[PDB]
Design an enzyme around this catalytic site. Structure first.
Site, PDB file in Angstrom:
ATOM      1  N   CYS A  68     104.367  12.393-124.436  1.00 30.92           N
ATOM      2  CA  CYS A  68     103.922  11.107-124.955  1.00 30.92           C
ATOM      3  C   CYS A  68     105.080  10.124-125.015  1.00 30.92           C
ATOM      4  CB  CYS A  68     103.301  11.280-126.339  1.00 30.92           C
ATOM      5  SG  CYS A  68     101.653  11.980-126.254  1.00 30.92           S
ATOM      6  N   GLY A 102     104.850  16.983-125.476  1.00 31.61           N
ATOM      7  CA  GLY A 102     106.080  16.220-125.478  1.00 31.61           C
ATOM      8  C   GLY A 102     106.148  15.111-124.453  1.00 31.61           C
ATOM      9  N   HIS A 160     102.294   8.229-133.254  1.00 34.47           N
ATOM     10  CA  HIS A 160     102.111   9.556-133.871  1.00 34.47           C
ATOM     11  C   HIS A 160     103.394  10.397-133.873  1.00 34.47           C
ATOM     12  CE1 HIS A 160     101.043  10.876-129.610  1.00 34.47           C
ATOM     13  NE2 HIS A 160     101.810  11.881-129.988  1.00 34.47           N
TER      14      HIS A 160
END
Ligand code: 4WI
Ligand code: 4WI
Lengths: 305, 305
Positions: free
Chosen positions: A145, A143, A41
């Site tokens: 991920c 942030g 993503h």
């Protein structure tokens, strides 16, 4: 002596963390040899994440749309592909700090260390367990991920988790390094919830052995039990069934202390039925279930990497 | 969201760990530039450690009696001196992985990460606090001495602890990196005991702010209190006095949440006087005192290094 929730040394993983930016979306990547792995993503805008078509979004991206930064150095992307929910970005330079590694899919009940990262830089390391409901109880912000979970065995880093999302109640969900989710979750901003969780029985038993090794022995009673009768009691208290495989992995701790596994089960049964009456075990007022049997042996024997 | 006991990333420190052997005694050392720092009782035999004369034992040692190994490489010792309870071994090679660093002496109540090592190799990392009685609640075995505690600020490692000994009840004692003990302890195998410990009040307050930030708010009551009246109540429960300096360091968390410090004190007072009645805060049934205010801000804001 002493017993602490202990993480693996994070240095081998720190040397692999990078920043990945696509458009205005930035998250962390894992740089192994000449490939960077990151959550797919990264290719989404804020508006795409509710109902993303990742294949379509990716078709519109070229290599140069991915800005990969290792420290203060940009890595040139020379290829890209999608595998399940991870992107694989081939870069023109191999990471010189690549450790010996493998990708593993861990089982519920097993523990690992998380190196929480933002913008490709490490913030902290902590130890957690894959819960029976396929979430982890982590600490993650916007942030985070692409932060990874891992175990170390001698010189080899086994990567088992990459972080993707936060579920209601502040628990976390992600994939293995092949991009396959743990649990029934999808990387879409939709109404998702984790199922009811359960206590990891074999880990509680392991932690009770840790307590005995440290001299915290008050809970040992004079009884034994059958496996079947223990599992009937545990069920009511939302403990998972104890299997013969679990009994077998408790073998080393049982042999070291001379306490038969089913005898420890009898003591645990009494704790569940009667409570701890204001007592603590290894300083905890609640029974702890995020140490595996091997975690206890490692810590109490000083295994190194 | 989520809140975990979090350690600093250990990589910068891992790159400094070495093995130091003198005779048959082996422990860990810290290799910074061309100097290795280690506990001086490496020069003791088992029989020397009850009543050691370190100056005398050291006079009988030459550079070549110290075997320093960094990985599978022996470092040639070219000088040696003793500073308080640490030995400083000058070696003929500077550690290329030396981080930016300083030596600091921390205050009771402050936290740091420990990289537990054996034979110069890291075993694990965990977070702990310098207790008011100048011990730490660690996890250390034979051969762990020379393991260090540290904080990281951006790129700079502040070393604050080197491990020397275990006291009764399984708590641990050591020195700063200038070899000065925290607390009244001596590096001799004698009858020593830590004094009674106290709960780190400012850290409990910080952790209650962490709970509010994570949405665990049930304990907030409608009252305020004076600093004096709070400290009278805390005293009976073996909490340390809350000072105006402590109030001031809680300022950022108080401003973020809008909860005045003395209002949080009123809520803590009620928890101490009435208990938690089977409730938990951030999953804990006991109040936690090993997060500093800055620890909470770092974790909840994602500070990196
Ligand atoms: C990755 N950097 C973040 C990590 C999140 C941010 C807050 N804490 C975390 O662990 N991941 C996301 O923001 C993902 C991303 C879109 C939405 N999302 C979520 O984690 C959201 N959760 C869900 O949609 C739910 F409930 F289904 F898990 C959010 C509400 C923002 C926590 C995608 C693609 C899942
Ligand atoms: C250093 N490698 C060890 C670390 C110890 C071993 C068990 N757990 C630890 O943290 N340090 C020592 O063995 C030091 C060393 C001699 C004796 N010692 C102790 O830690 C002993 N304790 C004490 O003498 C006491 F109580 F005073 F702290 C021991 C009984 C072995 C735990 C010297 C020079 C202090």
């Amino acid at each position: 002596s002493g017993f602490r929730k202990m993480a693996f040394p994070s240095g081998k993983v720190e040397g692999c963390m990078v920043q990945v930016t696509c458009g205005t979306t930035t998250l962390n990547g894992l740089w192994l040899d000449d490939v960077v792995y990151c959550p797919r993503h990264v290719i989404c805008t804020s508006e795409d994440m509710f109902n993303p078509n990742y294949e379509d979004l990716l078709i519109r991206k070229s290599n140069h749309n991915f800005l990969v930064q290792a420290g203060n150095v940009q890595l040139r992307v020379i290829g890209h592909s999608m595998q399940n929910c991870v992107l694989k970005l081939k870069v023109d330079t191999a990471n010189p700090k690549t450790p010996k590694y493998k990708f593993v899919r861990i089982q519920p009940g097993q523990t690992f260390s998380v190196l929480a990262c933002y913008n490709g830089s490490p913030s902290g390391v902590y130890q957690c367990a894959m819960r029976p409901n396929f979430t982890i109880k982590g600490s993650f912000l916007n942030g985070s991920c692409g932060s990874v979970g891992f175990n170390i065995d001698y010189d080899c880093v086994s990567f088992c988790y990459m972080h993707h999302m936060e579920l209601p109640t502040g628990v976390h969900a992600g994939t293995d390094l092949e991009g396959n989710f743990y649990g029934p979750f999808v990387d879409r901003q939709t109404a998702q919830a984790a199922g009811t969780d359960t206590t990891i029985t074999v880990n509680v038993l392991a932690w009770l052995y840790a307590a005995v090794i440290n001299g915290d022995r008050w809970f040992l009673n004079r009884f034994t039990t059958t496996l079947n009768d223990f599992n009937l009691v545990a069920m009511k208290y939302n403990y998972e069934p104890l299997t013969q495989d679990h009994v077998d992995i408790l073998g080393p701790l049982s042999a070291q202390t001379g306490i038969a596994v089913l005898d420890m089960c009898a003591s645990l049964k009494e704790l569940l039925q009667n409570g701890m009456n204001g007592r603590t075990i290894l300083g905890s007022a609640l029974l702890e279930d995020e140490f595996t049997p091997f975690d206890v042996v490692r810590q109490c024997s000083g295994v190194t990497f």
